[PDB]
Backbone atoms as SQL, in Angstrom:
CREATE TABLE atoms (id INTEGER PRIMARY KEY, chain TEXT, resi INTEGER, resn TEXT, atom TEXT, x REAL, y REAL, z REAL);
INSERT INTO atoms VALUES
  (1, 'A', 1, 'UNK', 'N', -9.537, 1.226, 30.006),
  (2, 'A', 1, 'UNK', 'CA', -9.980, -0.131, 30.713),
  (3, 'A', 1, 'UNK', 'C', -11.385, -0.585, 30.840),
  (4, 'A', 2, 'UNK', 'N', -11.910, -1.250, 31.483),
  (5, 'A', 2, 'UNK', 'CA', -13.542, -1.382, 31.884),
  (6, 'A', 2, 'UNK', 'C', -14.060, -0.346, 32.284),
  (7, 'A', 3, 'UNK', 'N', -14.928, 0.266, 31.409),
  (8, 'A', 3, 'UNK', 'CA', -15.525, 1.468, 31.473),
  (9, 'A', 3, 'UNK', 'C', -14.838, 2.815, 31.690),
  (10, 'A', 4, 'UNK', 'N', -13.791, 2.646, 30.970),
  (11, 'A', 4, 'UNK', 'CA', -12.689, 3.734, 30.928),
  (12, 'A', 4, 'UNK', 'C', -12.225, 4.098, 29.715),
  (13, 'A', 5, 'UNK', 'N', -12.711, 4.981, 29.070),
  (14, 'A', 5, 'UNK', 'CA', -12.274, 5.056, 27.660),
  (15, 'A', 5, 'UNK', 'C', -11.930, 6.427, 27.217),
  (16, 'A', 6, 'UNK', 'N', -10.500, 6.479, 26.556),
  (17, 'A', 6, 'UNK', 'CA', -10.291, 7.817, 25.712),
  (18, 'A', 6, 'UNK', 'C', -11.502, 8.216, 24.980),
  (19, 'A', 7, 'UNK', 'N', -11.281, 9.803, 24.760),
  (20, 'A', 7, 'UNK', 'CA', -12.264, 10.126, 23.635),
  (21, 'A', 7, 'UNK', 'C', -12.292, 9.576, 22.328),
  (22, 'A', 8, 'UNK', 'N', -13.388, 9.625, 21.623),
  (23, 'A', 8, 'UNK', 'CA', -13.556, 9.102, 20.467),
  (24, 'A', 8, 'UNK', 'C', -13.064, 9.755, 19.400),
  (25, 'A', 9, 'UNK', 'N', -11.758, 9.422, 18.625),
  (26, 'A', 9, 'UNK', 'CA', -11.405, 10.046, 17.367),
  (27, 'A', 9, 'UNK', 'C', -12.183, 9.786, 16.209),
  (28, 'A', 10, 'UNK', 'N', -12.546, 10.521, 15.445),
  (29, 'A', 10, 'UNK', 'CA', -13.693, 10.539, 14.361),
  (30, 'A', 10, 'UNK', 'C', -13.346, 9.786, 13.345),
  (31, 'A', 11, 'UNK', 'N', -13.754, 8.453, 13.182),
  (32, 'A', 11, 'UNK', 'CA', -13.041, 7.541, 11.836),
  (33, 'A', 11, 'UNK', 'C', -14.171, 7.346, 10.844),
  (34, 'A', 12, 'UNK', 'N', -15.418, 8.272, 10.810),
  (35, 'A', 12, 'UNK', 'CA', -16.287, 7.774, 9.939),
  (36, 'A', 12, 'UNK', 'C', -15.842, 8.354, 8.255),
  (37, 'A', 13, 'UNK', 'N', -15.058, 9.230, 8.304),
  (38, 'A', 13, 'UNK', 'CA', -14.638, 9.455, 7.054),
  (39, 'A', 13, 'UNK', 'C', -13.201, 8.534, 6.412),
  (40, 'A', 14, 'UNK', 'N', -12.727, 7.721, 7.421),
  (41, 'A', 14, 'UNK', 'CA', -11.568, 6.979, 7.031),
  (42, 'A', 14, 'UNK', 'C', -11.670, 6.201, 5.706),
  (43, 'A', 15, 'UNK', 'N', -12.826, 5.511, 5.607),
  (44, 'A', 15, 'UNK', 'CA', -13.014, 4.643, 3.863),
  (45, 'A', 15, 'UNK', 'C', -12.927, 5.484, 2.981),
  (46, 'A', 16, 'UNK', 'N', -13.437, 6.629, 2.719),
  (47, 'A', 16, 'UNK', 'CA', -13.473, 7.748, 1.802),
  (48, 'A', 16, 'UNK', 'C', -11.928, 8.067, 1.778),
  (49, 'A', 17, 'UNK', 'N', -11.461, 8.621, 2.629),
  (50, 'A', 17, 'UNK', 'CA', -10.320, 9.291, 2.596),
  (51, 'A', 17, 'UNK', 'C', -9.075, 8.152, 2.022),
  (52, 'A', 18, 'UNK', 'N', -9.088, 6.759, 2.880),
  (53, 'A', 18, 'UNK', 'CA', -8.096, 5.702, 2.309),
  (54, 'A', 18, 'UNK', 'C', -8.385, 5.516, 0.509),
  (55, 'A', 19, 'UNK', 'N', -9.659, 5.480, 0.163),
  (56, 'A', 19, 'UNK', 'CA', -9.970, 5.301, -1.143),
  (57, 'A', 19, 'UNK', 'C', -9.444, 6.526, -2.202),
  (58, 'A', 20, 'UNK', 'N', -9.573, 7.848, -1.543),
  (59, 'A', 20, 'UNK', 'CA', -8.790, 8.773, -2.209),
  (60, 'A', 20, 'UNK', 'C', -7.424, 8.576, -2.349),
  (61, 'A', 21, 'UNK', 'N', -6.628, 8.446, -1.241),
  (62, 'A', 21, 'UNK', 'CA', -5.201, 8.133, -1.363),
  (63, 'A', 21, 'UNK', 'C', -4.899, 7.036, -2.257),
  (64, 'A', 22, 'UNK', 'N', -5.693, 5.937, -2.172),
  (65, 'A', 22, 'UNK', 'CA', -5.278, 4.858, -3.279),
  (66, 'A', 22, 'UNK', 'C', -5.450, 5.258, -4.536),
  (67, 'A', 23, 'UNK', 'N', -6.648, 6.002, -4.681),
  (68, 'A', 23, 'UNK', 'CA', -6.957, 6.627, -6.355),
  (69, 'A', 23, 'UNK', 'C', -5.553, 7.419, -6.772),
  (70, 'A', 24, 'UNK', 'N', -4.968, 8.271, -5.755),
  (71, 'A', 24, 'UNK', 'CA', -4.044, 9.004, -6.236),
  (72, 'A', 24, 'UNK', 'C', -2.713, 8.132, -6.546),
  (73, 'A', 25, 'UNK', 'N', -2.454, 7.161, -5.868),
  (74, 'A', 25, 'UNK', 'CA', -1.262, 6.093, -5.853),
  (75, 'A', 25, 'UNK', 'C', -1.675, 5.223, -7.234),
  (76, 'A', 26, 'UNK', 'N', -2.816, 5.009, -7.643),
  (77, 'A', 26, 'UNK', 'CA', -3.119, 4.249, -8.774),
  (78, 'A', 26, 'UNK', 'C', -2.947, 5.102, -10.188),
  (79, 'A', 27, 'UNK', 'N', -2.970, 6.528, -9.954),
  (80, 'A', 27, 'UNK', 'CA', -2.851, 7.376, -11.174),
  (81, 'A', 27, 'UNK', 'C', -1.407, 8.117, -11.202),
  (82, 'A', 28, 'UNK', 'N', -0.459, 7.687, -10.282),
  (83, 'A', 28, 'UNK', 'CA', 0.494, 8.199, -10.268),
  (84, 'A', 28, 'UNK', 'C', 1.689, 7.612, -11.341),
  (85, 'A', 29, 'UNK', 'N', 2.488, 8.188, -12.143),
  (86, 'A', 29, 'UNK', 'CA', 3.251, 7.762, -13.329),
  (87, 'A', 29, 'UNK', 'C', 4.042, 6.572, -13.051),
  (88, 'A', 30, 'UNK', 'N', 4.756, 6.379, -11.607),
  (89, 'A', 30, 'UNK', 'CA', 5.491, 5.391, -11.212),
  (90, 'A', 30, 'UNK', 'C', 4.691, 4.238, -10.611),
  (91, 'A', 31, 'UNK', 'N', 3.382, 4.146, -10.777),
  (92, 'A', 31, 'UNK', 'CA', 2.707, 3.064, -10.127),
  (93, 'A', 31, 'UNK', 'C', 2.612, 1.829, -11.016),
  (94, 'A', 32, 'UNK', 'N', 3.042, 2.009, -12.274),
  (95, 'A', 32, 'UNK', 'CA', 3.049, 0.816, -13.079),
  (96, 'A', 32, 'UNK', 'C', 3.680, -0.584, -12.551),
  (97, 'A', 33, 'UNK', 'N', 4.899, -0.719, -11.621),
  (98, 'A', 33, 'UNK', 'CA', 5.065, -1.905, -11.056),
  (99, 'A', 33, 'UNK', 'C', 4.084, -2.504, -10.159),
  (100, 'A', 34, 'UNK', 'N', 3.063, -1.948, -9.853),
  (101, 'A', 34, 'UNK', 'CA', 2.345, -2.117, -8.602),
  (102, 'A', 34, 'UNK', 'C', 0.786, -2.193, -8.689),
  (103, 'A', 35, 'UNK', 'N', 0.383, -2.008, -10.056),
  (104, 'A', 35, 'UNK', 'CA', -1.026, -2.019, -10.207),
  (105, 'A', 35, 'UNK', 'C', -1.704, -3.435, -10.217),
  (106, 'A', 36, 'UNK', 'N', -0.995, -4.580, -10.570),
  (107, 'A', 36, 'UNK', 'CA', -1.635, -5.727, -10.625),
  (108, 'A', 36, 'UNK', 'C', -0.465, -6.629, -9.796),
  (109, 'A', 37, 'UNK', 'N', -1.051, -8.017, -9.467),
  (110, 'A', 37, 'UNK', 'CA', -0.446, -8.989, -8.819),
  (111, 'A', 37, 'UNK', 'C', 0.657, -9.350, -9.758),
  (112, 'A', 38, 'UNK', 'N', 1.795, -9.550, -9.086),
  (113, 'A', 38, 'UNK', 'CA', 2.970, -10.189, -9.762),
  (114, 'A', 38, 'UNK', 'C', 2.616, -11.634, -10.396),
  (115, 'A', 39, 'UNK', 'N', 3.027, -11.899, -11.658),
  (116, 'A', 39, 'UNK', 'CA', 2.547, -13.220, -12.232),
  (117, 'A', 39, 'UNK', 'C', 3.508, -14.142, -11.616),
  (118, 'A', 40, 'UNK', 'N', 3.082, -14.965, -10.616),
  (119, 'A', 40, 'UNK', 'CA', 3.803, -16.172, -9.911),
  (120, 'A', 40, 'UNK', 'C', 4.384, -17.132, -10.926),
  (121, 'A', 41, 'UNK', 'N', 3.798, -17.325, -12.049),
  (122, 'A', 41, 'UNK', 'CA', 4.111, -18.296, -13.322),
  (123, 'A', 41, 'UNK', 'C', 5.213, -17.737, -13.979),
  (124, 'A', 42, 'UNK', 'N', 5.328, -16.351, -14.134),
  (125, 'A', 42, 'UNK', 'CA', 6.291, -15.850, -15.058),
  (126, 'A', 42, 'UNK', 'C', 7.362, -15.139, -14.353),
  (127, 'A', 43, 'UNK', 'N', 7.458, -15.127, -13.218),
  (128, 'A', 43, 'UNK', 'CA', 8.545, -14.182, -12.429),
  (129, 'A', 43, 'UNK', 'C', 9.165, -15.225, -11.523),
  (130, 'A', 44, 'UNK', 'N', 10.410, -15.904, -12.033),
  (131, 'A', 44, 'UNK', 'CA', 11.174, -16.840, -11.324),
  (132, 'A', 44, 'UNK', 'C', 11.515, -16.260, -9.822),
  (133, 'A', 45, 'UNK', 'N', 11.398, -16.778, -8.596),
  (134, 'A', 45, 'UNK', 'CA', 11.816, -16.688, -7.774),
  (135, 'A', 45, 'UNK', 'C', 10.716, -16.106, -6.640),
  (136, 'A', 46, 'UNK', 'N', 9.749, -15.342, -7.503),
  (137, 'A', 46, 'UNK', 'CA', 8.993, -14.526, -6.467),
  (138, 'A', 46, 'UNK', 'C', 8.030, -14.991, -5.655),
  (139, 'A', 47, 'UNK', 'N', 7.309, -16.268, -6.131),
  (140, 'A', 47, 'UNK', 'CA', 6.759, -17.019, -5.248),
  (141, 'A', 47, 'UNK', 'C', 7.108, -17.580, -3.947),
  (142, 'A', 48, 'UNK', 'N', 8.650, -18.046, -4.030),
  (143, 'A', 48, 'UNK', 'CA', 9.136, -18.535, -2.868),
  (144, 'A', 48, 'UNK', 'C', 9.744, -17.551, -2.041),
  (145, 'A', 49, 'UNK', 'N', 10.167, -16.705, -2.497),
  (146, 'A', 49, 'UNK', 'CA', 10.857, -15.400, -1.844),
  (147, 'A', 49, 'UNK', 'C', 9.842, -14.337, -1.175),
  (148, 'A', 50, 'UNK', 'N', 8.843, -14.043, -1.691),
  (149, 'A', 50, 'UNK', 'CA', 7.756, -12.987, -1.229),
  (150, 'A', 50, 'UNK', 'C', 6.777, -13.880, -0.637),
  (151, 'A', 51, 'UNK', 'N', 6.770, -13.642, 0.660),
  (152, 'A', 51, 'UNK', 'CA', 5.883, -14.811, 1.424),
  (153, 'A', 51, 'UNK', 'C', 4.357, -14.045, 1.418),
  (154, 'A', 52, 'UNK', 'N', 4.147, -12.812, 1.017),
  (155, 'A', 52, 'UNK', 'CA', 2.930, -12.287, 1.119),
  (156, 'A', 52, 'UNK', 'C', 2.851, -11.064, 0.028),
  (157, 'A', 53, 'UNK', 'N', 2.567, -11.487, -1.243),
  (158, 'A', 53, 'UNK', 'CA', 2.428, -10.787, -2.326),
  (159, 'A', 53, 'UNK', 'C', 1.142, -9.598, -1.999),
  (160, 'A', 54, 'UNK', 'N', 1.410, -8.440, -2.526),
  (161, 'A', 54, 'UNK', 'CA', 0.457, -7.356, -2.405),
  (162, 'A', 54, 'UNK', 'C', 0.467, -6.257, -3.554),
  (163, 'A', 55, 'UNK', 'N', -0.495, -5.832, -3.994),
  (164, 'A', 55, 'UNK', 'CA', -0.647, -4.752, -5.048),
  (165, 'A', 55, 'UNK', 'C', -1.721, -3.945, -4.967),
  (166, 'A', 56, 'UNK', 'N', -1.820, -3.036, -5.960),
  (167, 'A', 56, 'UNK', 'CA', -2.921, -2.065, -5.605),
  (168, 'A', 56, 'UNK', 'C', -4.219, -2.407, -5.710),
  (169, 'A', 57, 'UNK', 'N', -4.312, -3.467, -6.930),
  (170, 'A', 57, 'UNK', 'CA', -5.353, -3.774, -7.356),
  (171, 'A', 57, 'UNK', 'C', -6.236, -4.746, -6.348),
  (172, 'A', 58, 'UNK', 'N', -5.424, -5.389, -5.418),
  (173, 'A', 58, 'UNK', 'CA', -5.839, -6.127, -4.373),
  (174, 'A', 58, 'UNK', 'C', -6.209, -5.336, -3.299),
  (175, 'A', 59, 'UNK', 'N', -5.319, -4.295, -2.971),
  (176, 'A', 59, 'UNK', 'CA', -5.924, -3.486, -1.918),
  (177, 'A', 59, 'UNK', 'C', -7.174, -2.789, -2.378),
  (178, 'A', 60, 'UNK', 'N', -7.284, -2.257, -3.522),
  (179, 'A', 60, 'UNK', 'CA', -8.630, -1.876, -4.042),
  (180, 'A', 60, 'UNK', 'C', -9.797, -2.973, -3.745),
  (181, 'A', 61, 'UNK', 'N', -9.478, -4.056, -4.257),
  (182, 'A', 61, 'UNK', 'CA', -10.806, -4.952, -3.986),
  (183, 'A', 61, 'UNK', 'C', -10.958, -5.165, -2.166),
  (184, 'A', 62, 'UNK', 'N', -9.868, -5.298, -1.397),
  (185, 'A', 62, 'UNK', 'CA', -10.100, -5.735, -0.160),
  (186, 'A', 62, 'UNK', 'C', -10.719, -4.085, 0.396),
  (187, 'A', 63, 'UNK', 'N', -10.495, -2.974, -0.077),
  (188, 'A', 63, 'UNK', 'CA', -10.759, -1.744, 0.368),
  (189, 'A', 63, 'UNK', 'C', -12.699, -1.989, 0.187),
  (190, 'A', 64, 'UNK', 'N', -13.047, -2.010, -1.062),
  (191, 'A', 64, 'UNK', 'CA', -14.197, -2.206, -1.560),
  (192, 'A', 64, 'UNK', 'C', -15.157, -3.038, -1.027),
  (193, 'A', 65, 'UNK', 'N', -14.535, -4.196, -0.261),
  (194, 'A', 65, 'UNK', 'CA', -15.501, -5.170, 0.277),
  (195, 'A', 65, 'UNK', 'C', -15.456, -5.377, 1.639),
  (196, 'A', 66, 'UNK', 'N', -15.108, -4.272, 2.312),
  (197, 'A', 66, 'UNK', 'CA', -15.066, -4.465, 3.783),
  (198, 'A', 66, 'UNK', 'C', -13.905, -5.241, 4.613),
  (199, 'A', 67, 'UNK', 'N', -12.744, -5.543, 3.702),
  (200, 'A', 67, 'UNK', 'CA', -11.821, -6.468, 4.196),
  (201, 'A', 67, 'UNK', 'C', -10.776, -5.598, 5.326),
  (202, 'A', 68, 'UNK', 'N', -10.847, -4.380, 5.431),
  (203, 'A', 68, 'UNK', 'CA', -10.043, -3.535, 6.324),
  (204, 'A', 68, 'UNK', 'C', -10.826, -3.140, 7.477),
  (205, 'A', 69, 'UNK', 'N', -10.289, -3.705, 8.693),
  (206, 'A', 69, 'UNK', 'CA', -11.118, -3.200, 10.001),
  (207, 'A', 69, 'UNK', 'C', -11.018, -1.954, 10.200),
  (208, 'A', 70, 'UNK', 'N', -9.713, -1.394, 9.974),
  (209, 'A', 70, 'UNK', 'CA', -9.371, 0.084, 10.351),
  (210, 'A', 70, 'UNK', 'C', -8.194, 0.384, 9.331),
  (211, 'A', 71, 'UNK', 'N', -7.997, 2.111, 9.312),
  (212, 'A', 71, 'UNK', 'CA', -7.095, 2.762, 8.600),
  (213, 'A', 71, 'UNK', 'C', -5.656, 1.915, 8.652),
  (214, 'A', 72, 'UNK', 'N', -5.284, 1.609, 9.855),
  (215, 'A', 72, 'UNK', 'CA', -4.185, 1.003, 10.128),
  (216, 'A', 72, 'UNK', 'C', -3.679, -0.384, 9.218),
  (217, 'A', 73, 'UNK', 'N', -4.834, -1.106, 9.271),
  (218, 'A', 73, 'UNK', 'CA', -4.677, -2.243, 8.509),
  (219, 'A', 73, 'UNK', 'C', -4.533, -2.089, 7.052),
  (220, 'A', 74, 'UNK', 'N', -5.009, -0.915, 6.522),
  (221, 'A', 74, 'UNK', 'CA', -4.957, -0.305, 5.186),
  (222, 'A', 74, 'UNK', 'C', -3.653, 0.084, 4.790),
  (223, 'A', 75, 'UNK', 'N', -2.912, 0.623, 5.800),
  (224, 'A', 75, 'UNK', 'CA', -1.523, 1.200, 5.843),
  (225, 'A', 75, 'UNK', 'C', -0.563, 0.174, 5.719),
  (226, 'A', 76, 'UNK', 'N', -0.824, -0.816, 6.453),
  (227, 'A', 76, 'UNK', 'CA', 0.079, -2.096, 6.458),
  (228, 'A', 76, 'UNK', 'C', 0.195, -2.659, 5.048),
  (229, 'A', 77, 'UNK', 'N', -0.804, -2.895, 4.339),
  (230, 'A', 77, 'UNK', 'CA', -0.781, -3.534, 3.013),
  (231, 'A', 77, 'UNK', 'C', -0.318, -2.571, 2.088),
  (232, 'A', 78, 'UNK', 'N', -0.328, -1.017, 2.286),
  (233, 'A', 78, 'UNK', 'CA', 0.144, -0.415, 1.237),
  (234, 'A', 78, 'UNK', 'C', 1.875, -0.428, 1.460),
  (235, 'A', 79, 'UNK', 'N', 2.400, -0.423, 2.675),
  (236, 'A', 79, 'UNK', 'CA', 3.817, -0.617, 2.933),
  (237, 'A', 79, 'UNK', 'C', 4.074, -1.913, 2.310),
  (238, 'A', 80, 'UNK', 'N', 3.421, -3.074, 2.721),
  (239, 'A', 80, 'UNK', 'CA', 3.792, -4.535, 2.216),
  (240, 'A', 80, 'UNK', 'C', 4.439, -4.304, 0.831),
  (241, 'A', 81, 'UNK', 'N', 3.351, -3.547, -0.122),
  (242, 'A', 81, 'UNK', 'CA', 3.782, -3.730, -1.665),
  (243, 'A', 81, 'UNK', 'C', 5.104, -3.158, -1.820),
  (244, 'A', 82, 'UNK', 'N', 5.642, -1.855, -0.746),
  (245, 'A', 82, 'UNK', 'CA', 7.066, -1.228, -1.009),
  (246, 'A', 82, 'UNK', 'C', 8.015, -2.018, -0.512),
  (247, 'A', 83, 'UNK', 'N', 7.743, -2.747, 0.767),
  (248, 'A', 83, 'UNK', 'CA', 8.559, -3.870, 1.173),
  (249, 'A', 83, 'UNK', 'C', 8.829, -4.774, 0.554),
  (250, 'A', 84, 'UNK', 'N', 7.921, -5.520, -0.075),
  (251, 'A', 84, 'UNK', 'CA', 8.295, -6.384, -1.325),
  (252, 'A', 84, 'UNK', 'C', 9.052, -6.060, -2.313),
  (253, 'A', 85, 'UNK', 'N', 8.932, -4.956, -2.747),
  (254, 'A', 85, 'UNK', 'CA', 9.243, -4.129, -3.893),
  (255, 'A', 85, 'UNK', 'C', 10.836, -4.107, -3.729),
  (256, 'A', 86, 'UNK', 'N', 11.336, -3.739, -2.474),
  (257, 'A', 86, 'UNK', 'CA', 12.668, -3.583, -1.850),
  (258, 'A', 86, 'UNK', 'C', 13.209, -4.794, -1.679),
  (259, 'A', 87, 'UNK', 'N', 12.609, -5.968, -1.354),
  (260, 'A', 87, 'UNK', 'CA', 13.186, -7.170, -0.950),
  (261, 'A', 87, 'UNK', 'C', 13.497, -8.043, -2.332),
  (262, 'A', 88, 'UNK', 'N', 12.843, -7.525, -3.455),
  (263, 'A', 88, 'UNK', 'CA', 13.040, -8.339, -4.837),
  (264, 'A', 88, 'UNK', 'C', 13.653, -7.611, -5.759),
  (265, 'A', 89, 'UNK', 'N', 14.009, -6.004, -5.746),
  (266, 'A', 89, 'UNK', 'CA', 14.341, -5.447, -6.770),
  (267, 'A', 89, 'UNK', 'C', 15.699, -4.468, -6.112),
  (268, 'A', 90, 'UNK', 'N', 16.826, -4.479, -6.947),
  (269, 'A', 90, 'UNK', 'CA', 17.829, -3.356, -6.656),
  (270, 'A', 90, 'UNK', 'C', 17.371, -1.985, -6.715),
  (271, 'A', 91, 'UNK', 'N', 17.829, -1.404, -5.518),
  (272, 'A', 91, 'UNK', 'CA', 17.669, 0.202, -5.566),
  (273, 'A', 91, 'UNK', 'C', 17.920, 0.896, -6.782),
  (274, 'A', 92, 'UNK', 'N', 18.920, 0.646, -7.710),
  (275, 'A', 92, 'UNK', 'CA', 19.527, 1.109, -8.995),
  (276, 'A', 92, 'UNK', 'C', 18.733, 0.432, -9.924),
  (277, 'A', 93, 'UNK', 'N', 17.287, 0.212, -9.723),
  (278, 'A', 93, 'UNK', 'CA', 16.729, -0.187, -11.022),
  (279, 'A', 93, 'UNK', 'C', 15.491, 0.491, -11.342),
  (280, 'A', 94, 'UNK', 'N', 14.892, 0.423, -12.482),
  (281, 'A', 94, 'UNK', 'CA', 13.654, 1.331, -12.445),
  (282, 'A', 94, 'UNK', 'C', 12.669, 1.007, -11.462),
  (283, 'A', 95, 'UNK', 'N', 12.194, -0.241, -11.564),
  (284, 'A', 95, 'UNK', 'CA', 11.388, -0.694, -10.339),
  (285, 'A', 95, 'UNK', 'C', 11.714, -0.412, -8.917),
  (286, 'A', 96, 'UNK', 'N', 12.935, -0.534, -8.539),
  (287, 'A', 96, 'UNK', 'CA', 13.601, -0.167, -7.289),
  (288, 'A', 96, 'UNK', 'C', 13.387, 1.339, -6.846),
  (289, 'A', 97, 'UNK', 'N', 13.656, 2.336, -7.904),
  (290, 'A', 97, 'UNK', 'CA', 13.429, 3.703, -8.010),
  (291, 'A', 97, 'UNK', 'C', 11.913, 4.004, -7.630),
  (292, 'A', 98, 'UNK', 'N', 10.955, 3.306, -8.383),
  (293, 'A', 98, 'UNK', 'CA', 9.528, 3.525, -8.592),
  (294, 'A', 98, 'UNK', 'C', 9.177, 3.284, -7.030),
  (295, 'A', 99, 'UNK', 'N', 9.664, 2.323, -6.462),
  (296, 'A', 99, 'UNK', 'CA', 9.074, 1.711, -5.029),
  (297, 'A', 99, 'UNK', 'C', 9.431, 2.551, -4.119),
  (298, 'A', 100, 'UNK', 'N', 10.424, 3.201, -4.180),
  (299, 'A', 100, 'UNK', 'CA', 11.070, 4.259, -3.103),
  (300, 'A', 100, 'UNK', 'C', 10.225, 5.308, -3.529),
  (301, 'A', 101, 'UNK', 'N', 10.253, 6.234, -4.669),
  (302, 'A', 101, 'UNK', 'CA', 9.092, 7.316, -4.828),
  (303, 'A', 101, 'UNK', 'C', 7.810, 7.069, -4.276),
  (304, 'A', 102, 'UNK', 'N', 7.112, 6.012, -4.892),
  (305, 'A', 102, 'UNK', 'CA', 5.715, 5.729, -4.279),
  (306, 'A', 102, 'UNK', 'C', 5.510, 5.698, -2.856),
  (307, 'A', 103, 'UNK', 'N', 6.666, 5.186, -2.103),
  (308, 'A', 103, 'UNK', 'CA', 6.660, 5.029, -0.585),
  (309, 'A', 103, 'UNK', 'C', 6.534, 6.343, -0.213),
  (310, 'A', 104, 'UNK', 'N', 7.540, 7.237, -0.559),
  (311, 'A', 104, 'UNK', 'CA', 7.587, 8.771, -0.224),
  (312, 'A', 104, 'UNK', 'C', 6.245, 9.498, -0.411),
  (313, 'A', 105, 'UNK', 'N', 5.722, 9.103, -1.398),
  (314, 'A', 105, 'UNK', 'CA', 4.364, 9.794, -2.034),
  (315, 'A', 105, 'UNK', 'C', 3.281, 9.483, -1.119),
  (316, 'A', 106, 'UNK', 'N', 3.423, 8.260, -0.687),
  (317, 'A', 106, 'UNK', 'CA', 2.086, 7.630, 0.002),
  (318, 'A', 106, 'UNK', 'C', 2.200, 8.018, 1.536),
  (319, 'A', 107, 'UNK', 'N', 3.603, 8.225, 1.919),
  (320, 'A', 107, 'UNK', 'CA', 3.629, 8.413, 3.310),
  (321, 'A', 107, 'UNK', 'C', 3.191, 10.114, 3.762),
  (322, 'A', 108, 'UNK', 'N', 3.721, 10.849, 2.872),
  (323, 'A', 108, 'UNK', 'CA', 3.327, 12.562, 2.927),
  (324, 'A', 108, 'UNK', 'C', 1.616, 12.248, 2.936),
  (325, 'A', 109, 'UNK', 'N', 0.994, 11.746, 1.848),
  (326, 'A', 109, 'UNK', 'CA', -0.268, 11.790, 1.999),
  (327, 'A', 109, 'UNK', 'C', -1.174, 11.324, 3.264),
  (328, 'A', 110, 'UNK', 'N', -0.364, 10.140, 3.664),
  (329, 'A', 110, 'UNK', 'CA', -0.626, 9.692, 4.909),
  (330, 'A', 110, 'UNK', 'C', -0.852, 10.616, 6.264),
  (331, 'A', 111, 'UNK', 'N', 0.381, 11.149, 6.305),
  (332, 'A', 111, 'UNK', 'CA', 0.671, 12.294, 7.518),
  (333, 'A', 111, 'UNK', 'C', -0.181, 13.069, 7.176),
  (334, 'A', 112, 'UNK', 'N', -0.243, 13.866, 5.952),
  (335, 'A', 112, 'UNK', 'CA', -1.119, 15.175, 5.775),
  (336, 'A', 112, 'UNK', 'C', -2.623, 14.958, 5.799),
  (337, 'A', 113, 'UNK', 'N', -3.091, 13.648, 5.725),
  (338, 'A', 113, 'UNK', 'CA', -4.556, 13.452, 5.655),
  (339, 'A', 113, 'UNK', 'C', -4.827, 12.911, 7.364),
  (340, 'A', 114, 'UNK', 'N', -4.181, 12.095, 7.977),
  (341, 'A', 114, 'UNK', 'CA', -4.577, 11.499, 9.247),
  (342, 'A', 114, 'UNK', 'C', -3.589, 12.026, 10.558),
  (343, 'A', 115, 'UNK', 'N', -2.501, 12.770, 10.229),
  (344, 'A', 115, 'UNK', 'CA', -1.597, 13.060, 11.686),
  (345, 'A', 115, 'UNK', 'C', -1.650, 14.549, 11.647);
């Protein structure tokens, strides 16, 4: 509260470490469904159904331009990519499986780096 602060958790490396994680996700073999924004003209249903589209290229641009105020807003956009994928894709599809694999991969890197 006013003039009463918990000790300062060092956040000075968070930008670098989020960028490293994002690189690792970009280079995973199963990242191909997530690299670029879904083409809203060519994928029926996507525009109406997926209220907040998100992809790794869009995260990378946001990261590079100071649009994440802290590491939790970064994790929220990564999870959004996989939550969108689950909303639109059957679990037993290549893209559905890709999304489960990537979410697992991300959550381990997240825990190992920051928890």
